[PDB]
Ligand binder design. Structure first.
Ligand SMILES: NCCCNCCCCCC(=O)CS
Ligand SMILES: [K+]
Ligand SMILES: [K+]
Ligand SMILES: [Zn+2]
Length: 620
């Protein structure tokens, strides 16, 4: 019941500069704001988002996270001459003050709060606020590291007070530790702060021992502060994704936050003179996408850092692209996280295991198409469509004469072909769903016709306790199976998850979806995902999240096959393919027989598929 994305921006926040010479601050230039908006204008993204005017944050809204003494100190900056602002900023670490900075800082704060109102009032689905100056380094009574007021800390307290929110998730993917956010919510379990950052064993700015993975939280908030220190530069995409799959996403879904706030700093990308990482801008399209099912999509992205004018624009658009639901780009070259990242991931998982038990270890135009059974017609949203051709029927006649029958299953396969060509050609449609008939002839005609589309690699997800419908050996097809009978997994190109029926089914499926299925599928880089569900539910609770997270692969091109018409599950499949917001799962403990089965599958697979590794490999 909510649509669109908010883009909050104003040219006035680019009207304060660094005046004196300061090599530490020279990277923070007003051009960062102009290049980011102009890149959104060039790619047709800014014009596609609901623009929201910028307001000033009131004095009381700023006092939510700051003290009157420090606010009054900043309040007297616009009356200072260059000699006086140089002295006022020498009182702090790596920050400069301008005659207009107090004005724009209140705009950066107000713009953020206005983004929370837009998202929480269901006026838009998600949003981004291109603001300046940043926020995550400022604290109750100090301006630190380019930041005057903590914009994201305002948003969380603001949403806590004005919307009675009990659980808020802050994600800070800047390369600098947002200590101002951690300080403010240190003893606070209502706001889960996660932050990866360049650390290099405290040798990197801001050189804090609190930035380390040891800092977990004080008092009743312990376990809701998660630091992931990068100790080596050049972190690649596989390092960032492994952090999500094995640290951030398992804790987030367990948290089940009512609002996701993102400290989007893009100095964590390739070419940045401060972060010196090697992550492509395209990785951010997936970072945001992996967080969409949380808080039913209610995600407020707020700009933080990013200082390579060319690298900054590209990642801002990748973020807005996935915010609007555009297809995420395929990412290749993924594999094992580097040994330093595996060490840091291993340490933080351990220290946090006492608070999140999932980390324990044993001691050592139209987007979707719907073809339902003939005659029926359902209420499908503004991204969907129904069905055939004689060019495809000539094909279908060839498959019957060669490999197989007479029935209207030929129409099911004839429609499977028509959408498959519509997905891989024309970009006519993206994903698709086919309520289907006989399973074996349907999957065989679907896959074999998909590999000749061509589809370099095809990922197949099948939920049901059936027999293997197609084989997997030639290295071009990977298969995931959900079932009830243990298949005694033999081949590496497969992954069979045997679950025990119960109330712990959905909680275990999510642990296997984030810890196993997603890391394998991302390293696989498929050209098409083929989902099939047997008519033999617990899937209804979780299938929505599965269909949305897996769309990060294959540029979204997913074909789903449902046997036996289930109106509730068919409507759930189409809604998640259409890009609609996904209902939360609520707060979350899998059976010990389940996690024993998955780590058994991980050890069995983590050698070929390195993205499964969450520990540094024990060298022989
Ligand atoms: N070559 C590394 C020198 C360290 N300089 C620290 C500058 C503070 C930047 C703060 C920032 O990025 C806000 S997100
Ligand atoms: K950070
Ligand atoms: K916290
Ligand atoms: Zn930064």
């Amino acid at each position: 019941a909510a649509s669109g994305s908010a883009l909050i921006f104003d040219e006035e926040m680019s009207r304060y500069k660094l005046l004196w010479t300061d090599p530490a601050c020279e990277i923070e230039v007003p051009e960062r704001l102009t290049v980011s908006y102009e890149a959104l204008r060039t790619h047709g993204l800014a014009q596609r988002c609901k623009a929201v005017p910028v307001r000033q944050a009131t004095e009381q809204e700023i006092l939510l996270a700051h003290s009157e003494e420090y606010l009054e100190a900043v309040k007297q900056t616009p009356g200072m001459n260059v000699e006086e602002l140089m002295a006022f900023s020498k009182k702090y670490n790596d920050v400069y003050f301008h005659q207009n900075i107090y004005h724009c800082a209140k705009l950066a704060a107000g713009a953020t709060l206005q983004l929370v109102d837009s998202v929480m009032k269901r006026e838009v689905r998600n949003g981004m606020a291109l603001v300046r100056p940043p926020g995550h380094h400022s604290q109750r009574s100090a301006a630190n590291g380019f930041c005057v007021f903590n914009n994201v800390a305002f948003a969380a307290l603001y949403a806590k007070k004005n919307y009675n929110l009990n659980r808020i998730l802050i994600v800070d993917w800047d390369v600098h530790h947002g200590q101002g956010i951690q300080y403010c919510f240190e003893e606070d379990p209502s706001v889960l702060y996660f932050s990866w950052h360049r650390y290099e064993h405290q040798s990197f700015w801001p050189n804090l021992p609190e930035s380390d993975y040891s800092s977990v939280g004080k008092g009743k908030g312990s376990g809701f502060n998660i630091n992931l220190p990068w100790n080596k530069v050049g972190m690649t995409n596989s390092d960032y994704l492994a952090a999500f799959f094995h640290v951030l996403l398992p804790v987030a879904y367990e948290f089940d936050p009512e609002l996701v706030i993102v400290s989007a700093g893009f100095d964590s990308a390739i070419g940045d003179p401060e972060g010196e990482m090697c992550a492509l801008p395209e990785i951010f399209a997936h970072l945001t996408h992996l967080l969409m099912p949380l808080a039913a999509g209610k995600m407020c992205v707020v700009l933080e850092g990013g200082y390579n004018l060319t690298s900054l624009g590209q990642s801002v658009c990748q973020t807005v692209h996935s915010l609007l639901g555009d297809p995420t780009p395929r990412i290749s070259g993924l594999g094992t996280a580097c040994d330093s990242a595996l060490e840091s991931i291993q340490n933080v998982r351990n220290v946090q295991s006492s608070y999140w038990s999932s980390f324990k270890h044993l001691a050592q135009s139209v987007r979707t198409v719907v073809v339902p059974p003939p005659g029926v017609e359902l209420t499908l949203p503004k991204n969907c469509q129904h069905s055939i051709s004689e060019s495809t029927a000539k094909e279908v006649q060839r498959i019957r004469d060669k490999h197989f029958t007479d029935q209207n299953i030929l129409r099911s396969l004839g429609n499977i072909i028509s959408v498959l060509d519509r997905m891989m050609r024309s970009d006519e449609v993206c994903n698709g769903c086919v309520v289907v008939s006989d399973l074996s002839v349907s999957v065989q005609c679907a896959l074999q016709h998909a590999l000749t589309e061509p589809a370099e690699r095809v990922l197949v997800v099948y939920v049901g306790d059936g027999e293997l419908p197609v084989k997997t050996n030639d290295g071009k097809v990977f298969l995931v199976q959900i079932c009830t009978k243990e298949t005694e997994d033999k081949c590496v190109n497969r992954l069979t998850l045997c679950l025990r029926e119960g109330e712990s089914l959905t909680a275990g499926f999510m642990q296997a979806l984030l810890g196993l299925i997603l890391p394998v599928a991302y390293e696989f880089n498929p050209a098409l995902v083929l989902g099939i569900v047997e008519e033999t539910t617990r899937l209804m609770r979780v299938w929505g999240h599965m269909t949305c997270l897996i769309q990060g692969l294959a540029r979204g091109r997913m074909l789903t096959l449902l046997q036996g018409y289930d109106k509730d599950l068919l409507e759930l499949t189409v809604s998640a393919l259409s890009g609609a917001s996904i209902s939360p799962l609520g707060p979350r403990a899998p059976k010990p027989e389940d996690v024993e089965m998955m780590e058994k599958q991980r050890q069995r697979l983590q050698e070929r598929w390195g993205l499964l590794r969450c520990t540094v490999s024990e060298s022989w």
